[PDB]
Design a protein around this ligand. Structure first.
Ligand SMILES: Nc1ncnc2c1ncn2[C@@H]1O[C@H](CSCC[C@H](N)C(=O)O)[C@@H](O)[C@H]1O
Ligand SMILES: Nc1ncnc2c1ncn2[C@@H]1O[C@H](CSCC[C@H](N)C(=O)O)[C@@H](O)[C@H]1O
Ligand SMILES: Nc1ncnc2c1ncn2[C@@H]1O[C@H](CSCC[C@H](N)C(=O)O)[C@@H](O)[C@H]1O
Ligand SMILES: Nc1ncnc2c1ncn2[C@@H]1O[C@H](CSCC[C@H](N)C(=O)O)[C@@H](O)[C@H]1O
Ligand SMILES: Nc1ncnc2c1ncn2[C@@H]1O[C@H](CSCC[C@H](N)C(=O)O)[C@@H](O)[C@H]1O
Ligand SMILES: Nc1ncnc2c1ncn2[C@@H]1O[C@H](CSCC[C@H](N)C(=O)O)[C@@H](O)[C@H]1O
Ligand SMILES: Nc1ncnc2c1ncn2[C@@H]1O[C@H](CSCC[C@H](N)C(=O)O)[C@@H](O)[C@H]1O
Ligand SMILES: N[C@@H](CCC(=O)O)C(=O)O
Ligand SMILES: N[C@@H](CCC(=O)O)C(=O)O
Ligand SMILES: N[C@@H](CCC(=O)O)C(=O)O
Ligand SMILES: N[C@@H](CCC(=O)O)C(=O)O
Ligand SMILES: N[C@@H](CCC(=O)O)C(=O)O
Ligand SMILES: N[C@@H](CCC(=O)O)C(=O)O
Ligand SMILES: N[C@@H](CCC(=O)O)C(=O)O
Ligand code: NA
Ligand code: NA
Ligand code: NA
Ligand code: NA
Ligand code: NA
Ligand code: NA
Ligand code: NA
Lengths: 252, 257, 251, 251, 251, 251, 251
């Protein structure tokens, strides 16, 4: 928009914390082999909040069959979270697949309704070339100590435009029930297409969550929700104190 | 020549002589206080009488009911801003980390712009009633900005927005300009039938199940417009209307219940 | 010592307070409408205090007896209770609000209270003749109470609590204390008052402290440890608020 | 037809009633203390009615709107509601109590109402000028209400409800109905008033009937079955009491 | 002494009471229908009393034993209990109601009772022969009880409770006390009766006080503090009502 | 066909039943004490029936209307209901118990009822003049009811329910049905009665079936599937008991 | 001495009882169907007893141990417990039912038991050879129990409980008592048995009294007050029922 200060942005202090913690992580006297035993030293409030919210969503579907999907993965923050939480809560559930969809090359197009702020452009949020192999190596590293680590395709990264890949994935996987659907695409067109595609695979109790439903910078999820279902189709909720995610329990 | 019996004005809610005395006494005690100037804002409950305290506690009760609902807080009918002040402070109490909880206040700031015959029950239903002074919205924006400058997210602007003009135009316009909008709490305090009806129709696509819709004068004989509006748009049994016990207003419903 | 290690206002909190002061005293709101729009000037920190007093009062609506504040200053909490009593208890003329203070600031301090630079005789003094003004304010709320014809529903007791609280209790053998709010900061009067009020509490009475765990004012904690022990009852916070700390007698 | 198959007083109920009437009119209690000792004369059957009106009113304390009674007679329930409103709602001047009656007894009956020997025009008539006396009684309660300066908080509407209820509603478009108490006995006015009040109920409003399943007075049942159906909402009793039967609108 | 600091009727309370007295004694309601319309004359303050007695009784419906009132005067509470016993306990002939009074007003007072100007020998006296009338009233209720054939289910015990309560208990070793209602006002007989009744309470018995925290009558408080302590059990109000204060024995 | 696939008494259940019959009819208990010791002769199977009837009755104590049994035989359940009504509802003279039967056994059967060897006309016939005796038993219970002076609180309707249930409803337009107990066994009369009673049920009324899922008597099931569907409401058991199966109307 | 102050049958209760006795003994029900229709003859007062025994038994379904009744007479409650054990505990062969009595009536009385005219030696005597018949009745129930092959699951112990209860316990050191039902009426044996059973109760065991607060039989109360105190545990009623009074051990 004109006044960029009306969009959510980091305070100078949030920026300082982030930069100091980056410096302390990369220049730490902690022995290299102990870094992964002390990561909360570097995990600041904003990111801790994200982790606790993913944990709250996952706990709500421990009694719901099916898979976890994220639309919009970037570097995989949420997928790493879900892989560890699946360890915590579901050692004996080899059917709880985690599926992450992304181009991995950033926004592949935008609609005029997404062009509110200056970051709505093709390629925004691109990750490095060959990143999906790295992210799959990370997920494989968590899986090798899972009780069901011998079962493969428990994590799947689907590369390309969700308008094509989500319907294709579903056609190839007619066993699918979706327990948790996490929408983090920002943009109107793919959100709408994916909401339409996933509907037959939800049960009553499935959770559908949105990372930017009510953000002025990214009105696409709301415009999509209003077109496909209506904002009062189901009860949208926050976890108190956190502006996102917004989430609904299908059928409520 | 013969005359009919007119309306008994005592049938409308009005201040008792004692309520008037309390109000006038506290006004004098505030304006002529021995408390040091800089401490007045640390002792305002000295001057906050039962009737106004009750309003504060009711706003707090409505806000607490939407702490787990996404979206914004809208007040239709702001006057000097009593409720917006209240919401700004409560948003600090409950939601330091929620920069999306916008507070949007709509008013002409020049009083009622017209009235309908159905609003013409008591003696204050006329154009301009409730006008606040020229330049008032700038002052109210200074007040809201003063609260915001100590908010955790005080660096994010447009978290309190005053929208000036007739809600029949400005509410549809605001919504068209803000397609991200979800409405968590919609506080109706316009009194009059026509703008109430128009705004109820406009806000519907932006409510979720669990959004609260509240009315300041729903069942008040002096201001039947909110009721007439609701009976036209939704029906009084569309959702369960509730009171906070012991308080004649607000009446509020939880959308979808 | 590092004064920064004591709780103090951020520059932004100071800015908000000063701007709201300026906007209240220079307002275009017509004079007779100011008391209809006070929340415009009631910032987060003070709103929180009001919500906490309301939470404490709501916990004793089913407990007999009176409300006492030890340490009144300008009367912020007494004004709050007077209005809340209107909201919740139109028909209870026995719910007396009793505020104790010298009204001339701390009358002495103990060495255990001298942690920060504001622990000195006379700190928090209010202007000469202030109690009459505070009583006029309380009388202004009472004149529209349902039981406004009953006097001594608010009582200001002037002097050192070491003498005045035992004297009040001896003069009022009907007393049950429903809510006892400790905001004296200092060790010695806190200890004396806790000892004095004990026989007038019931199970369910609330005892609250405004500075129990504050490094600047360790007197309430030193007093509680001497008289009862910190685990005599369950001390609690209202979540998100460092004070008050409060306990339900007998739990 | 056996009249013994209809509800009627046992010889013991009649003896209690007649004895209490004598003890009340010939009491040694000083005249100015009679109204401080009325439960002396309030027998189980009337006490039950009082407790039931209290239970219905408590269920709508969080529902906006007014209390209506269709079929007032001497005003037993109106006096009950006026006192309870004082107990529960000192600060609610919008809780109007509206009582509708011809005050001259049944104005007509339908053939379906003619089951027992008391279904005739004029049954339950009260004396000429009675409404002004009942209004004096309600005004006497109101002059000590917190909102006693607001008039028309108790309204007696005289005439046939088939005309007066629609007229009242037309003149009062602010109306929400929190509690609607049907005590007309007869089919036709019950049907007409049920139809009239529907747009003014909310989910959670209470609709109650005084004789819904009484063999002597099937008109409320016949009306309910025609307008709504008996399974439109859940009809309930207060356990142990044959009447009222009541439903929560929308359940 | 400021008599205005004691609870007293507002001019409007006095007006309501006097108007309702006039309207009851000059009523166009047919004489035989007065006892079917008593709520017309039952104002807020007295309705509140009735609802409180109902609340206390409801709490002992699962507790064995009898109901006792110490301090009956004209029998307001006994009338209420007799009707409620019919509503709740048709099949319980062991639920005796026992009322104790001199029926000649306070028989003595102690210095601690002499706070206000009504603490004198003979205050609250009722007329000569009043107990026989109150017994006739209670008998009138009982003649339509399911267990109306069992006598001595309502007992009036005349004399000073210091002698009569220990004597009643010695003559009735089957006694369990379910509800003990203290309304004597005075210190000495409250203390004596509290001491006497203790072996007959069970956990769950209710002990209630009519003036526990009233400045005019500190004797119940002084007595409680001597016999049990105010924190022996949790004293409670019914919210919004300054009395009774009651505790559940053993809590 | 294998008759052992139908429910039938074990040799031990037969021995219990025959022993207790002998012990009842040759008892050294004095004749006038037999009715004070009937549980001596009340075996597990029959005790279970009694407890289930009590569970169903307790579910409708807050629902208006009457109790109907379709299929009475000697009146086991009507006796049970008459006594329970005394236990729970002394003050409810509107809680009529209505029992329908030919009292001459099954009046016809349908091919779908002919699964076992007892589906024949006249099965379950009771002696000539039996309804007069059953009426004398019910009147014996009723003469110690609180409302024993009100007649027709127990009604025996003789004839084929296809004709008698619609006729009873037409003659009783006040009817609400709180509990409907189906024990006809046969398809056609169950279907006919389910259709007839529907306009007289409220949400919360209980509809119970004595043989819903028994292979010997599929007629209630066939009827339910025709009229409502088995998933119209939630059918339930009392855990541990194969019958009755019951639903709460509207759930 | 007014015998009317003791609980006694109304003329209507006597008429019910006498009618049902005649109807039982002159019944047109076939002899082999009498035990399938006993609720016909089971009036409200006895139905209540049955429901109360059921409520007590349900409270100990999660408590180990045996059921004991002190004071059996003809065995009303033992027959009830035998049937209930079948309903709830097919798979529990350790739930012994033990009934103690002289079976020749009261063997002596104490002066404290001599309040009414039935406190005499031999009151409640049952016929010579009665215990052998009661054992036949209990064995008839047991021969269709799932654990009917295990003997001694119901035991009749003949003699004075002062000797037989301590002897039984000494002989049965495995005993836990889940439910102890005191129905001896008399002071001395009640006290002796309360003393004896104490080491065999667990927290949650139920101790119940049939006449704890009955003026005619103060012995259970006197014994309680001597051995434990009436506030040792919380005594309760089943609401609406004067007896039994019961406590949960340890509460
Ligand atoms: N049509 C489309 N198909 C596939 N990915 C898309 C898309 N539109 C947007 N995206 C992806 O949406 C992502 C927002 S990805 C999200 C951030 C991430 N969940 C985190 O927690 O850090 C971008 O990586 C973008 O490439
Ligand atoms: N059509 C319309 N457009 C905008 N404002 C309107 C309107 N109709 C009524 N109003 C406004 O509704 C307000 C009613 S008074 C508002 C009171 C305020 N909420 C308080 O708490 O003190 C007036 O200021 C009036 O100007
Ligand atoms: N011994 C004593 N006797 C009486 N007052 C005392 C005291 N020691 C401390 N105080 C009082 O305790 C007060 C602390 S400041 C009280 C703040 C006030 N409750 C508010 O909410 O703003 C001072 O006014 C001080 O004079
Ligand atoms: N069509 C109609 N219009 C107005 N009143 C009617 C009516 N039909 C019946 N009524 C009134 O219904 C009343 C029934 S008696 C009401 C009893 C009263 N509620 C009490 O508690 O004592 C009569 O007074 C009768 O006049
Ligand atoms: N020592 C004593 N013995 C007996 N009665 C006493 C007493 N001391 C006080 N009383 C009685 O206590 C009573 C107080 S007034 C009782 C009010 C009554 N319960 C009501 O509800 O209206 C007086 O009647 C007085 O005579
Ligand atoms: N069409 C019909 N009309 C009337 N009664 C019928 C009927 N069809 C079956 N019945 C009756 O249904 C009864 C089934 S036996 C009922 C058993 C009884 N309720 C008990 O608890 O012991 C028979 O008496 C039979 O005559
Ligand atoms: N010391 C003692 N020893 C044994 N039995 C005693 C006793 N004192 C009293 N009893 C018995 O207590 C019994 C009281 S009557 C018991 C009634 C029985 N429970 C019923 O439900 O009908 C008498 O049979 C009497 O003999
Ligand atoms: N949805 C992402 C990115 C938002 C953005 O960059 O605007 C987040 O919450 O951090
Ligand atoms: N709704 C505003 C104004 C009412 C009016 O002026 O009538 C209030 O409650 O104070
Ligand atoms: N207790 C007071 C004063 C604290 C101080 O000055 O140290 C407060 O909370 O503001
Ligand atoms: N409905 C009124 C009157 C009934 C009648 O007279 O029949 C009552 O319950 O008393
Ligand atoms: N306790 C009695 C008497 C009070 C008095 O007279 O002082 C009451 O509440 O009315
Ligand atoms: N329904 C009856 C009869 C069963 C039958 O005869 O088959 C019962 O449960 O005993
Ligand atoms: N306790 C036995 C006998 C009572 C008696 O005979 O007094 C009963 O409840 O019937
Ligand atoms: Na976000
Ligand atoms: Na209002
Ligand atoms: Na503090
Ligand atoms: Na009725
Ligand atoms: Na009192
Ligand atoms: Na069956
Ligand atoms: Na008994």
């Amino acid at each position: 928009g004109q006044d960029l200060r009306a969009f959510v942005h980091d305070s100078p202090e949030e920026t300082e914390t982030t930069q100091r913690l980056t410096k302390l992580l990369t220049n730490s006297p902690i022995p290299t082999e102990e870094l992964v035993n002390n990561l909360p030293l570097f995990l600041r409030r904003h990111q801790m909040t994200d982790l606790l919210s993913m944990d709250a969503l996952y706990r709500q579907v421990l009694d719901v069959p099916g898979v976890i999907m994220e639309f919009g993965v970037r570097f995989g923050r949420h997928l790493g979270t879900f892989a560890a939480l699946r360890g915590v809560y579901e050692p004996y559930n080899p059917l709880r697949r985690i599926v992450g969809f992304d181009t991995f090359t950033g926004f592949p197009d935008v609609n005029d309704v997404d062009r509110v702020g200056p970051t709505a452009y093709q390629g925004r949020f691109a990750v490095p070339g060959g990143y999906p192999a790295y992210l799959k190596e990370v997920l494989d590293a968590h899986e090798c100590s899972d009780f069901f680590g011998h079962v493969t395709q428990r994590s799947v990264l689907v590369e390309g435009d969700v308008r094509e890949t989500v319907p294709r994935y579903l056609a190839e996987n007619p066993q699918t029930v979706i327990a948790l659907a996490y929408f983090d695409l920002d943009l109107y067109e793919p959100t709408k297409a994916v909401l339409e595609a996933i509907r037959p695979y939800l049960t009553k109790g499935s959770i559908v969550a949105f990372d930017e439903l009510d953000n002025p910078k990214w009105p696409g999820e709301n415009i999509a929700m209003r077109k496909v279902l209506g904002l009062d189709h189901a009860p949208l909720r926050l976890l108190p104190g956190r502006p996102a995610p917004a989430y609904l329990r299908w059928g409520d």
